[PDB]
Amino acid sequence: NVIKTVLTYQLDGSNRDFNIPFEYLARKFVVVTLIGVDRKVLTINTDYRFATRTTISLTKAWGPADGYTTIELRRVTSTTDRLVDFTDGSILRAYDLNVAQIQTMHVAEEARDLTTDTIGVNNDGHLDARGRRIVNLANAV
Amino acid sequence: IKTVLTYQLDGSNRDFNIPFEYLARKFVVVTLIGVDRKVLTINTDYRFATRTTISLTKAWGPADGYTTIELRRVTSTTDRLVDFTDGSILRAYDLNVAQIQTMHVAEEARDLTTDTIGVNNDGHLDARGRRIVN
Amino acid sequence: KTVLTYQLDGSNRDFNIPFEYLARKFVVVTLIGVDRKVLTINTDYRFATRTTISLTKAWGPADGYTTIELRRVTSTTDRLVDFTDGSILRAYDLNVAQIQTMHVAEEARDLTTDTIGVNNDGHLDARGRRIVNLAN
Amino acid sequence: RSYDMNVETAAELSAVNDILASIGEPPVSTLEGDANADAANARRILNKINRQIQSRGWTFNIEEGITLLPDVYSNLIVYSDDYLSLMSTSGQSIYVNRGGYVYDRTSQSDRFDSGITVNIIRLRDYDEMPECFRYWIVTKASRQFNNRFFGAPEVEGVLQEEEDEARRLCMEYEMDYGGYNMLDGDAFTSGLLTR
Amino acid sequence: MRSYDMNVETAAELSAVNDILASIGEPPVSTLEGDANADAANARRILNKINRQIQSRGWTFNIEEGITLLPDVYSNLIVYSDDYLSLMSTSGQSIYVNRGGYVYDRTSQSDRFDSGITVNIIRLRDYDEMPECFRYWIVTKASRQFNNRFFGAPEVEGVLQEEEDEARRLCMEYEMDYGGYNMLDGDAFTSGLLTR
Amino acid sequence: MRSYDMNVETAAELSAVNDILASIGEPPVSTLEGDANADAANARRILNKINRQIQSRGWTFNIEEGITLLPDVYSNLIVYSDDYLSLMSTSGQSIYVNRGGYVYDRTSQSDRFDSGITVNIIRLRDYDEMPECFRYWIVTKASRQFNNRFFGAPEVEGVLQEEEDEARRLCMEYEMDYGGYNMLDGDAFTSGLLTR
Amino acid sequence: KIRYTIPSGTYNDDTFTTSIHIPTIYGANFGRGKITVLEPDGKITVFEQP
């Protein structure tokens, strides 16, 4: 039910450190986007930093004055590019087997957490749009 | 075939069948659906009478405030049942369980239609008496 | 993408398969008419190549079925690779073991997006459908 | 190893591997299949120790003022097997287990019109324990595992020392979490301090 | 629980494992990458175990006071990670527990938060991030436990018992020097009593 | 004496027996049903023996005060069952004993009662009905007595002796927490002395 | 144990199976036992007895 791969925090205009609760295999798999009037994606080394493996430090504080109410931390694991590919000559290793298993789990888990990209039931009995517009509704009757 | 299914609640019944395959009992989640949603605990509120059925210690119904019960499979993504350790014998059982566990998560990944709006016969978007927020 | 449709009134049988599939039982072919018709493989379509399906009969908009849907449904219960002790561990078998779960995940990325999804502007793109039964 | 990964490992498998490591055995990669006696024995001792330490009673796990609602028809409150401790909120306790149901010994009744309010300890998972408590559970489980399934006496003296230290750090956690004060936090002395 | 063996080895972690291996007389390994070395793999597991245990005890350098934990805006849940070795209140009796992997207010019986909570938290750090004296104590304690579990030499047990006590003593000296604690003016209660 | 072998096996009783079996290093059994397992049968016999013994000691949770035992209207006999682990008077010196399986008033030298008698009684309870701490003490004491009689390992003896002492201590902590006894206002004598 | 080159016409496309005949392989029939087919790359497929 509750999404574990997409974490979004309120932006107060003075806090620049945000926690990463979910696992990830590469820092590029973590996507930092500021939500507000628009959804602005941030750059790995110019807009933020990995202060620790569980903490993202923004270079600049963002807030409602900047037009961004929330910041979102989302894991996007590569589906076409696998981190481990076995060869007919390679020594089988525990690390390679772990990464292959974990990468498929993240892809499966990210698929199971797609209520973020649709209208799904939140903790309460309410369908959640999660701070974006329902565009192209057009006429109503 | 479905990893999520719901049974209507009456005070007479206490046994509910589990159709799906679960690797661990903690992967099965039992919730009471009414005006309020309540997750039950493994031993105080129910039990596993057999592998494929769950028996509640208490009978529930409209008087208690819950008209339906939901039996859902939630395989753990963070807590993997298999972790390969260096210098350990590579067993085919470990490889198969690692493949099944990630498959179960992906199997539940294609059952989010229940937790979504859904589409009508007319092709509209049917919010089943649910407010849309944010 | 795991779902694609072709509408061909003229005499044509061949439809290129965009998605990768592990087994022929995973590709399911339906006819989207007034009511959907699920077609068996041997009677209705042959795999002329791994990339293309040659659906027997025209099945054109002359019939109600008009367009043809190529859907990938990977089986969760059935695993194409089952590791057995005493068998040579093959890099192919290890690689395809992850792929089957990934394909199921890919098919899930489209089933949820089907009813309602998010467009490239980061907004939920409705298909022009009223939100009925909505509670205030 | 490439990439700056951030991944977790299941704590129960880590706890079991710590128990097998205590007697010098290689770790297992998995805990299911029901064909591994070491997995069955270590996991069973881990649950027993986890159950036993939680039942002792700590500020973080003693839930105060919890209401247990009876059945609407039978008016029976189930006395759960996972109720490690059930007491009254104050004074002498009056509720006992009688046939799996909460029984009021003073009034001699299993029937309750409304929910009772009790001081309850309900069994939690090993994952939900504080890190110091997890170490104490694992250390105590390892010590019990050696006494029952290894039997080496030099391991006993080592794990006896470790459990004593493990319990000490959990006792430090209880006081830091408790924040107990005998002047104003005290139930009786706080009244005596009013001028 | 954080995976110790899934990241690149640091020079200090390589040094620590070889020190643990030396305790029973195993020769040093060049890398922590999988070479089917059961002893090195066992040493790393005990190294991680002792690293978590000593950090969770609590020290001025690693106890973070006044830390805000932010909730998810749409779920109102604050995650209680397994890397939170200790989570307390800033003052008085603590009210937050772990329930299902999320922060739970036991007094209010709620896991929903509209705003961040301020807690006294110990978060797991890398062994590379430990002070030098604390690294020595972790290795000494890991070496002692490693010998007890996988060799059991009683002569090695006695010496590492003395080494750990000395290693813990020097960590206590570090913690007092780092803390700079004063019972007159650095005291919460007595400093108020000193005003004339 | 109540039969321990003749009813359905419960999860706790099965868990208790496997705990007792583990004390000498025996693997767990799936069921308590007769499979010619002498060790499991021996463990269940000691489990029942220890269960009766600790309950008969007397605790606030299991001592029933003011219980009325009713006689048979046509025989005027009150049965003194073997499940009455203790039978006392509510106050002062006790006057009832067991004579031929029936309650006997030793002061009046009669076993005939026209009406119910009020007694402080301990009645045998299932091991399920015991508090978690008391279940652990019963298992720990049964495990110690099982090893003493059927294996006799001296190293196991020493550890189980220490475990029983800890188990009994935690049952004593439960006794006072459950009891909530006060010497000022909860005292039979002092509370009267506190009135001004 | 026998080395067998699979002949033409054994593969059926409507079933996507290459079915080999045991009497063709051995010149003989069999009653009981698991059958293992070993490919040169190491792929093992095991056939349980009907």
Closest-CA distance of chain G to residue C42, Å: 6
Judge contact between C3 and C47, C-beta under 8 A. Answer: no
> Rounded to whole angstroms, what are the CA distances from A117 to A25, B18, B24, C116, D169?
22, 30, 29, 9, 45
* Chain E touched by A94 (CB under 8 Å): yes
Token code pair at residue B74: 């939630």
Contact list, D86 vs chain F (CB under 8 Å)? 131
Query: Is the alpha carbon torsion for C89, C93, C99, C103 positive or negative?
Result: negative
Q: How far apart are CA D41 and CA D35, in angstroms?
A: 11
* Chain D touched by A23 (CB under 8 Å): yes
Judge contact between D34 and D58, C-beta under 8 A. Answer: no
Asked if the Cβ–Cβ distance from A119 to B116 is below 8 Å, we say yes
Q: Is D92 helix (H, G, I), strand (E, B) or coil?
A: coil
Token code pair at residue A118: 């649709």
Neighbours of A102 (CB within 10 A): 28
Q: Is B7 exposed, middle or buried (0-12, 13-18, 19+ CB in 10 A)?
A: middle
Asked if the Cβ–Cβ distance from D6 to A99 is below 8 Å, we say no
Q: Which residue of B has its CA nearest to D7?
A: B78
Q: What is the CB-side half-sphere exposure of residue A31 using CA atoms within 13 A? A: 13
Judge contact between F171 and D81, C-beta under 8 A. Answer: no
Partners of chain D (3+ Cβ pairs below 8 A) = A, B, E, F
Q: Is E93 helix (H, G, I), strand (E, B) or coil?
A: coil
Asked if the Cβ–Cβ distance from E1 to D17 is below 8 Å, we say no
Asked if the Cβ–Cβ distance from B87 to E5 is below 8 Å, we say no
Judge contact between D63 and D122, C-beta under 8 A. Answer: yes
* Chain A touched by C94 (CB under 8 Å): yes
Closest by CA position to B130, among listed A129, E83, E184, E90:
A129
Closest by CA position to B31, among listed B9, B2, B63, B10:
B9
| Those residues with Cβ within 8 angstroms of residue F185's Cβ, 6 or more apart along the chain or in another chain | F191, F194
Contact list, A19 vs chain E (CB under 8 Å)? 69-70, 79
Closest by CA position to D169, among listed A23, E77, C58, E85:
E85
**Does G have 3 or more CB contacts under 8 Å with E?**
no
**Per residue, what are the HEC states of chain C?**
CCEEEECCCCCCCEEECCCCCCCCCCEEEEEECCCEEECCHHHHEECCCCCEEEECCCCCCCCCCCCEEEEECCCCCCCCCCCCCCCCCCHHHHHHHHHHHHHHHHHHHHHHHHHCEECCCCCEECCCCCEECCCC
Judge contact between F91 and F55, C-beta under 8 A. Answer: no
**Does C have 3 or more CB contacts under 8 Å with A?**
yes
Contact list, D7 vs chain A (CB under 8 Å)? 23-25, 98, 102
> Rounded to whole angstroms, what are the CA distances from A104 to B101, B105, D145, E134?
10, 10, 36, 38
Closest-CA distance of chain C to residue G20, Å: 21
Q: Which residue of A has its CA nearest to E69?
A: A19
Contact list, B66 vs chain A (CB under 8 Å)? none
**Does E have 3 or more CB contacts under 8 Å with B?**
yes
Contact list, D33 vs chain B (CB under 8 Å)? 93
Q: In chain E, what is the straight-line distance between the N-terminal and C-terminal CA atoms, in Å? A: 52
Element at B102 (helix H, strand E): helix B92-109
| Those residues with Cβ within 8 angstroms of residue E196's Cβ, 6 or more apart along the chain or in another chain | none
Name which of G11, G12, G13 to mutate to probe chain C: the one with the most chain C Cβ atoms within 10 A of its Cβ: G13
Asked if the Cβ–Cβ distance from A101 to B80 is below 8 Å, we say yes
Contact list, A27 vs chain D (CB under 8 Å)? 4
Neighbours of A14 (CB within 10 A): 8
Closest-CA distance of chain A to residue B40, Å: 15
Neighbours of A96 (CB within 10 A): 19
Name the D residues in 45-74 with CB < 8 Å from any B CB: 71-73
- Name the structure determination technique: cryo-EM
Q: What is the CB-side half-sphere exposure of residue B42 using CA atoms within 13 A? A: 10
Q: Which residue of F has its CA nearest to D118?
A: F178
Asked if the Cβ–Cβ distance from A115 to C117 is below 8 Å, we say no
Closest-CA distance of chain F to residue D96, Å: 6
Q: How far apart are CA B93 and CA B96, in angstroms?
A: 5
Of E36, E37, E74, the CB nearest to B134: E74
Burial readout D30-66 (b: 16 or more C-beta within 10 A, e: otherwise): bbeeeeeebbbbbbbbbbbbbbbbbbbbbbbbbeeeb
* Chain E touched by B85 (CB under 8 Å): yes
Q: Which residue of B has its CA nearest to E1?
A: B79
State the DSSP code for B87. Answer: T
Question: What is the experimental resolution, given in Å to one decimal place?
Answer: 2.7
Contact list, A101 vs chain C (CB under 8 Å)? 98
* Chain C touched by A104 (CB under 8 Å): yes
Closest by CA position to F151, among listed F40, F44, F63, F39:
F39
Neighbours of E167 (CB within 10 A): 23
Q: How far apart are CA D2 and CA C120, in angstroms?
A: 32
Q: Is E139 exposed, middle or buried (0-12, 13-18, 19+ CB in 10 A)?
A: buried
Contact list, A7 vs chain E (CB under 8 Å)? 72
Q: How far apart are CA A24 and CA A20, in angstroms?
A: 9
Q: Which strand ranges, in their side-by-side order, compose the sheet holding A48-52?
A: A17-19, A55-58, A48-52
Query: What is the residue-wise DSSP string for F119-146?
Result: EEEEE---GGGS-HHHHHHHHHHHHHHH
User: For chain B, how big is the Rg over CA atoms in Å?
Assistant: 18
Q: How far apart are CA D150 and CA F141, in angstroms?
A: 21
Query: Is the alpha carbon torsion for F11, F17, F23, F25 positive or negative?
Result: negative
Judge contact between F122 and F64, C-beta under 8 A. Answer: yes
Contact list, A95 vs chain D (CB under 8 Å)? 1
Which residue has tokens 């029939």?
Answer: G29
Contact list, G16 vs chain C (CB under 8 Å)? 24
Asked if the Cβ–Cβ distance from D1 to A95 is below 8 Å, we say yes
> Rounded to whole angstroms, what are the CA distances from D75 to B45, B77, D101, D102, D110?
16, 40, 10, 10, 8
Closest-CA distance of chain E to residue D107, Å: 30
Closest by CA position to A92, among listed E16, C83, B103:
C83
Judge contact between A130 and A8, C-beta under 8 A. Answer: yes
Q: How far apart are CA C55 and CA C43, in angstroms?
A: 9
Contact list, D31 vs chain B (CB under 8 Å)? 81
